């Protein structure tokens, strides 16, 4: 079958800066009625693909002109000007010349961009949880940049190490930054044991972690 | 005024079958070929197959075996079936219309995520994430859903049924033990927060739950 090879996996580009992905079909893919059926895909998380590119180098309806195709038998490129925040997500190459029709692997777009200093925000357990007898400790790291973050949990002065649950999104849609969730998963009655709770980002945009706390009662 | 409705089961046991029905709005059967394409974290993105407009089917030939393809062109039905399902077959199901040469009903459906387990339904309960002044920095506000404890996935969730976009964090899922849990997030003006109500709107299709979850100050 065409395998469809795509690079790079990731690719780095400048908030404003022109992104190049690259597909390369193994052997030629022009369909019997002499039309070539490559595509460009791009995947939002959590959203269905949709249709930039297609026939190698048409764009869709909607499409900014941004966005372009190019390249020849083997070898294609999608181009996008003046990448913006709106652009983020995984883009798919596609031929359907040949049956089995096939996929590249996807190459995801990530934007590089100024630093920012996490917000922080922490949330008791609601009293919803707290009647079922489970209590987490929730506290956002907000649209900050790079990536790379650290999170240092306290009850009652005392560090909590281990047992903190940490997802994180891709990069924002908006403004192009990282937003991480942290949770202290306890017992209604584990939770009641202490009063004070804090969570602390340490980020190196500040060598001071910011900082959220509440108290109980 | 182009769609592709998707109608099928969360959850498969082994070796059984999966059923889905794509319907489509917008354009003819008896005029376009619609395709059946997975998407599994596993192998990215497998094209299954396509039932073209005079009903001829070509199917990818990984598949062939246990798979079938056919359509009701008076009802815009398209219907996939896949026979004795094991663990890895385990993903997101669409049908689409891909592989355009002049019109433009390049469209995919919302997707069917298929979970091939012996496991039971379970709905998520839905807690709120109310802020308090603990959760504010500068002059935003985050507010937060806390999504806990269903199976299988998916769930969505949006905010304010989709209006509220920019400043939305959805957290993607992760197991705890057997049962999932997610959180989203939205940020928000601290001026929106005295007179706005803000709702998170939670969705787990598997259940047929759709939880409206009113977040509001500590
Ligand atoms: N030289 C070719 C030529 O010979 P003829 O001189 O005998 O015409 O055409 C032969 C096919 O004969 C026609 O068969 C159709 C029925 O077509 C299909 C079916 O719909 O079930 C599909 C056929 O598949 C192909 C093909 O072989 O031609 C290849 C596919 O890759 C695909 O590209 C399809 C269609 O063109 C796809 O159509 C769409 C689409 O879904 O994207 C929709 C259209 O609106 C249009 O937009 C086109 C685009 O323009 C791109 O083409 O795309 O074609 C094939 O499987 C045949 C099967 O062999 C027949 O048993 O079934 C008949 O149409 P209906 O009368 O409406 O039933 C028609 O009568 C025939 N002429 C081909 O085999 C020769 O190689
Ligand atoms: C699923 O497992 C089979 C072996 O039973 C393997 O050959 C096949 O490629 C796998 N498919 C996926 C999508 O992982």
Same mark, same amino acid.
Request: hydrophobic fraction near 30%.
């Given at each position: 079958?065409?395998?469809?090879?795509?690079?790079?996996?990731?690719?780095?580009?400048?908030?404003?800066?022109?992104?190049?992905?690259?597909?390369?079909?193994?052997?030629?893919?022009?369909?019997?009625?002499?039309?070539?059926?490559?595509?460009?895909?791009?995947?939002?998380?959590?959203?269905?693909?949709?249709?930039?590119?297609?026939?190698?180098?048409?764009?869709?309806?909607?499409?900014?002109?941004?966005?372009?195709?190019?390249?020849?038998?083997?070898?294609?490129?999608?181009?996008?000007?003046?990448?913006?925040?709106?652009?983020?997500?995984?883009?798919?190459?596609?031929?359907?010349?040949?049956?089995?029709?096939?996929?590249?692997?996807?190459?995801?777009?990530?934007?590089?961009?100024?630093?920012?200093?996490?917000?922080?925000?922490?949330?008791?357990?609601?009293?919803?949880?707290?009647?079922?007898?489970?209590?987490?400790?929730?506290?956002?790291?907000?649209?900050?940049?790079?990536?790379?973050?650290?999170?240092?949990?306290?009850?009652?002065?005392?560090?909590?190490?281990?047992?903190?649950?940490?997802?994180?999104?891709?990069?924002?849609?908006?403004?192009?930054?990282?937003?991480?969730?942290?949770?202290?998963?306890?017992?209604?009655?584990?939770?009641?044991?202490?009063?004070?709770?804090?969570?602390?980002?340490?980020?190196?945009?500040?060598?001071?972690?910011?900082?959220?706390?509440?108290?109980?009662? | 005024?182009?769609?592709?409705?998707?109608?099928?089961?969360?959850?498969?046991?082994?070796?059984?079958?999966?059923?889905?029905?794509?319907?489509?709005?917008?354009?003819?059967?008896?005029?376009?070929?619609?395709?059946?394409?997975?998407?599994?974290?596993?192998?990215?993105?497998?094209?299954?197959?396509?039932?073209?407009?005079?009903?001829?089917?070509?199917?990818?030939?990984?598949?062939?075996?246990?798979?079938?393809?056919?359509?009701?062109?008076?009802?815009?039905?398209?219907?996939?079936?896949?026979?004795?399902?094991?663990?890895?077959?385990?993903?997101?199901?669409?049908?689409?219309?891909?592989?355009?040469?002049?019109?433009? *009903?390049?469209?995919?459906? /919302?997707?069917? !995520?298929? $979970?091939? @387990?012996?496991?039971? #339904?379970? +709905?998520? &309960?839905?807690? %709120?994430?109310?802020?308090?002044?603990?959760?504010?920095?500068?002059?935003?506000?985050?507010?937060?859903?806390?999504?806990?404890?269903?199976?299988?996935?998916?769930?969505?969730?949006?905010?304010?049924?989709?209006?509220?976009?920019?400043?939305?964090?959805? *957290?993607?899922?992760?197991? /705890?033990?057997? !049962?999932? $849990?997610? @959180?989203?997030?939205? #940020?928000? +003006?601290? &001026?929106?927060? %005295?007179?706005?109500?803000?709702?998170?709107?939670?969705?787990?299709?598997?259940?047929?739950?759709?939880?409206?979850?009113?977040?509001?100050?500590?």
């Amino acid at each position: 079958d065409v395998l469809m090879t795509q690079t790079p996996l990731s690719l780095p580009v400048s908030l404003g800066d022109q992104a190049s992905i690259s597909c390369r079909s193994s052997q030629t893919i022009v369909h019997k009625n002499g039309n070539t059926y490559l595509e460009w895909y791009l995947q939002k998380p959590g959203q269905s693909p949709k249709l930039l590119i297609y026939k190698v180098s048409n764009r869709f309806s909607g499409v900014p002109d941004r966005f372009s195709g190019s390249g020849s038998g083997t070898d294609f490129t999608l181009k996008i000007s003046r990448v913006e925040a709106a652009d983020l997500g995984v883009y798919y190459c596609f031929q359907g010349s040949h049956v089995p029709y096939t996929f590249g692997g996807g190459t995801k777009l990530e934007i590089k961009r100024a630093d920012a200093a996490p917000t922080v925000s922490i949330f008791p357990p609601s009293s919803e949880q707290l009647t079922s007898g489970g209590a987490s400790v929730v506290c956002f790291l907000n649209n900050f940049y790079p990536k790379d973050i650290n999170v240092k949990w306290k009850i009652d002065g005392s560090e909590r190490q281990n047992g903190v649950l940490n997802s994180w999104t891709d990069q924002d849609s908006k403004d192009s930054t990282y937003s991480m969730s942290s949770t202290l998963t306890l017992t209604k009655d584990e939770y009641e044991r202490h009063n004070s709770y804090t969570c602390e980002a340490t980020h190196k945009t500040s060598t001071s972690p910011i900082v959220k706390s509440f108290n109980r009662n | 005024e182009v769609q592709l409705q998707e109608s099928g089961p969360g959850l498969v046991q082994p070796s059984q079958s999966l059923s889905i029905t794509c319907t489509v709005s917008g354009f003819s059967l008896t005029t376009y070929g619609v395709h059946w394409v997975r998407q599994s974290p596993g192998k990215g993105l497998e094209w299954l197959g396509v039932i073209w407009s005079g009903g001829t089917t070509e199917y990818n030939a990984a598949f062939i075996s246990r798979l079938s393809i056919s359509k009701d062109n008076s009802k815009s039905q398209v219907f996939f079936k896949m026979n004795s399902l094991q663990t890895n077959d385990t993903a997101i199901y669409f049908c689409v219309r891909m592989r355009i040469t002049t019109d433009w *009903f390049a469209y995919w459906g /919302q997707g069917t !995520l298929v $979970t091939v @387990s012996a496991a039971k #339904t379970t +709905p998520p &309960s839905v807690y %709120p994430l109310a802020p308090g002044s603990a959760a504010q920095t500068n002059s935003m506000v985050t507010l937060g859903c806390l999504v806990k404890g269903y199976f299988p996935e998916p769930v969505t969730v949006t905010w304010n049924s989709g209006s509220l976009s920019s400043g939305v964090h959805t *957290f993607p899922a992760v197991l /705890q033990s057997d !049962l999932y $849990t997610l @959180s989203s997030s939205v #940020t928000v +003006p601290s &001026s929106t927060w %005295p007179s706005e109500t803000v709702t998170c709107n939670v969705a787990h299709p598997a259940s047929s739950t759709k939880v409206d979850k009113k977040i509001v100050p500590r």
